[model samples]
Target chain A: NLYFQSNAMTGYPYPRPQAVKIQVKGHVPYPKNALATVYDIFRDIETVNKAHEAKEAPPFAIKDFNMNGFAITSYLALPTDTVTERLKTKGFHTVGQPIYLPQNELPPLYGLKGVTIQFRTPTAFKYNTGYVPEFYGPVFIKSITESYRRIIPGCPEFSTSDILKYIRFTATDLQKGKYRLTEELMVTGFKGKVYLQFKLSTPPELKLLILYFLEAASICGVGMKKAWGMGDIYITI
Target chain B: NLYFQSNAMTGYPYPRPQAVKIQVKGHVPYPKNALATVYDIFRDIETVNKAHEAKEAPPFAIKDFNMNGFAITSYLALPTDTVTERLKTKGFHTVGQPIYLPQNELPPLYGLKGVTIQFRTPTAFKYNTGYVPEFYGPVFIKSITESYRRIIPGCPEFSTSDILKYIRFTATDLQKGKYRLTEELMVTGFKGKVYLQFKLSTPPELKLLILYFLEAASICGVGMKKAWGMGDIYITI
Candidate 1:
């Protein structure tokens, strides 16, 4: 490795270069527990990176997605080196490549997981991440900031804003018309299975790191019951 | 029967003798019925009106009123004239103070083009005369126009037509039930348990006119069932 050829610029390109998008799709025929399935997908990354130890926003951002047939798919964007390598080793090296989760004895999280979690308190589960969920942009962003800080290290803090001006998004319930996997959950849920479709705007205070956390969610999956495969989503950009 | 001094170009004191405000109150322990309809809400107005045959918004605008003790899924607004020996009492002695449904309802418009309304109701609330977000203008104009038409008789017909163009609104119903209906017509029910909040924008033809409709919705009630206490709303102006 010649110094001139390498530019001699010592740099660590882990998390930043780790920022990438993924396209994922699958059809679990005669399926059940789609929420569980999706949760397992996210569980993979959290377990691999010890996010509970690292605790940064999931390093993903997943746009809203729904199940079609016994099938689902979407792009999963990642911004962490560990997550990217793990995903590739676990098989995202090509398009239309099949990736899946397996059944296990123990649950991944609370019955619903961090679907509608409160950064302020575990008791503040009032905002849901279900079909009819609430996104306290500031709350969600703040946690992501915390998670990002823990893992990436040396990054400055960002404000978690409640003012909607910085967030442009909608929480809409999507009706999943009888899919064996995602349907049982809605058996006692909001009339429509609407999820949050969101985007960030302005205030450099957020814009940069915002990218990091969303990338986390893309891998972790969002909303409640991700452990049970709930919050299954796909994303782009 | 005009006296020389009293009648010589001086108008006789009649309709709006002093344009005064009256405070009325009443206690109806338990409502006789729950199904609110235009006919019943009209009774709230009819109880005070000497103009029995008159069918329209009164010269005076009534403020939005709700149950003092119990939570009324029904929302109402009303006006009064004279209670007399010649007029038989309808056995209902419901009383309420005069409230203004204008100017005070804030200009909480999402930029004055339109408004975001949270359909707040126990049984999951429904319509308040959309009749347009700029509806107060048409209703106010129509009220003034109609009153003028009635007094002048030969005046032309004013229009109170339904012409609100739908902009766009994200519907997510989730607020659960409170009160119940007995004889439950169950016809055209709003989203059952889910709460629906709407954000609407005004069309150019409706921009300046938006405030009027919001007032009409807030104070006059939207849709036809206001008389029976239908369209009650909580608006983010």
Candidate 2:
């Protein structure tokens, strides 16, 4: 994998990943701070990657990101006998299907308005400011870029002045209606404060590329402790 | 549709449909007596059925059964367009997609140590004779036979002399770990009791007919108050 120092204006050369989503049925009492969540998908891939070329990791892993599930980190669920055979070598516990997408399909995005995604679960984000959790336009923008970086080898980041121009967000955390949860873990003796969401909005146009990352984030999850069930985001366009 | 009151001492002329499964995800605070919840899938089916050819409450409605989420309901996520389309026309809002299956795929049953299905979610059944809300072989057998009757329109029920002979079940509602839940609904002024589960075992040839019903039960959900969320069962082969 070669590193691209500059954003030299690009499109990932490799086939863009097909958008894949799986319906996951979890334990009756879905676990809180449910670790070992979606990471298992990549775990399966790694187990398969060990064949032909045995390596400690996939050489390029999913950055070990977390989701309440990715378990939302929906990746390519390949159906081909070839991909399926390799995948089945080490059995998978989650019942799922792989959705493959157009090998090359990118249409320029246009002006859009207030689009929102309802939060079906809790979400977390790493930040420098408020504990209630705030989204810095540029910062969220960066995570979107990094998401693509995970996809295409050395996928370069593009500046999102367009997004910074149209996108503004609000996390509605009212003292009465909102839930600010603080949990303590035994092994690490660590405490984390988390908040539940009613909903969040995004401006259309943004970057089509960033949206791809956001889609990945939908599955891979954003922020920290995702494997622990802290971040669960579903974005609606 | 002619009524074949007799088991006719024969199998349905068409091939027995194949058995399929999927994973399901549920809420952290899983619904109690979660039976009626999944009917929305069928609820929409009728709505669509009406649109295409004026329909009924559901010329064939899910028996309005319920259970906990399959904790056995593997009918979780599916990714076929033809399958997802009819499914998508009627929107559903549970943990995720309810994979729908069709066709005659039952192969010969073979060397098996009595087929077993573990109830992942708590399931409650009403009955006479016993205070324990239960599944005596005949009672469960009757329900299973009825399940197929719903699908093939004129599908008939079978006697359960065999299920009675080869089945055994265990529920975990013990004095130590058991939690007997009872609640009164204000709307109808009705009282309901609930119990959790451990596992259920059956002979290899429990009943091929009921297996089809079990598949539908996996998605349409089973038992009563399914819309409320109960009787969510998944039959594993």
Candidate 3:
């Protein structure tokens, strides 16, 4: 069986923010036209890498832009109450995400309990929360994370919608395949510019090493490109 | 069931004499030829009546002439000794005179016994004795006389075959309402010339009157026509 999501950002300001999680179980194949897109305020790739090495979060430039002649402010922030409140007010909450699996896995998936989380979005995302023997051990996580990271980048801070855009792209790729690169470019509004960043996950064993690197970088007093910002951070693995 | 006979006659006296008895019983209609021939003979009605009164057996003569120009004696008898010898040879010793019965008395004569004699030479005669019921009656005598008188006027004096012829014809006519005229004719060799006589029995008073008339005329006697002779007579109750 397969699950999927689309249009994942909507109804953000309400007391409860919604998030869509999609899970597909059993054997699956790569979908068609699976390409990853990245956006960053830090234009220099080398500076972004240095900050990643130092384990310091980097700040992103906040901007207010005219969207279809309407002014809209876009920024990245940690999951804080203030930030959540602003996102809610702007109607930027989690939306539906879709998961897809290959045709062969449908029988076994049907035998297991299926769960779906419906964000205030166009579609519902599904997950296998119930224990299923087939989805045990490293293989399960490996598969889910690979799918998740391809759809939603874990590194740079961004608005709720930015994350949802990625999820939508991934779902589209898994379901219909070969999504429009043009559409992605238009949504990010990053025409004629390219940005790159490393999504780091801090392993438990590398925690101390990451702290040491940050101290050393402070002693060296990094250049402007290498300066730490609030937008860039590592996710703990 | 009437019985009759004719007087027996004799044949060549060389080795042995043969006597023949002819018994007859019924009546049959006359054929066209027989009727015509009978009419021709009766054309001389007065002569016929005279012949009858004279007791002449045949009013006409017949010749034994064949289509081959062969002629032979066709007499009904040859001699009396021939018939007597024939009877004696057959072991019929006790003989009696031939008894005749009128038509009314014919049936009652069934069991009477008598001998049949045939006159051949005017004086010579032959006889055959037969048992009553087995032997004598009006029918038998009538047949013999009629058959013989057809071909030979003196046949009753010459042969006994006429008796046989008469009985056969009468029996045939009685049984089938038709006589085997051809058979009788052939047997008697009288082919086209047979005749019949009819007789009726009367009461004693009538008999006496008949006898008185006969005695006044000096007539010899009155007798029946047997069942075979030339006339047909009926007795009314």
Candidate 3 wrong stretches, greater than 4 Å: A1-237, B1-49, B52-142, B153-174, B178-237
* Cα shift from native, residue B87, model 1 (Å): 13
Tens-place lDDT per residue, model 2, B1-237, is: 122322222322322332233333333223333223333332322222342254222222222222322322322122222223333353422334433354345675444323444443344454465223344445555655554443332222234674455445444431211222224331111122212121234333344434554555544344443323344454555
Q: After superposition, how far is residue A206 of candidate 3 from its true place, in Å?
A: 99
* Model 2 lDDT per residue over A15-60, tens place: 2433443333333223332223333333433223342155221211
Instruction: Locate the minimum summed-lDDT window of 10 residues in model 1 chain B.
Output: B8-17
Model-by-model lDDT, in order?
A: 0.32, 0.37, 0.22
lDDT, residue B101, candidate 2: 55
- Candidate 3's displacement at residue A150, Å, is 99
Can you tell me which runs of candidate 1 are displaced by over 4 Å? A1-237, B1-97, B105-113, B122-166, B174-188, B191-205
How well does candidate 2 score on lDDT at residue A28?
A: 21
Model 1 over residues B145-165: C-alpha lDDT tens digits?
333333222211223453223
The candidate that achieves the highest lDDT relative to the unseen native structure: 2
TM-score of chain B of each: 0.41, 0.47, 0.19
lDDT tens digits, residue span A1-237, model 1: 112112111111124212233343333332343333433455533222344357433334332223432222222222123333434554433234223211122232112111322111011112445343444445545544444443343332233553235555434433322212343334222213223233323333233234555544434444443322334433333
lDDT value, residue B7 of candidate 2: 26
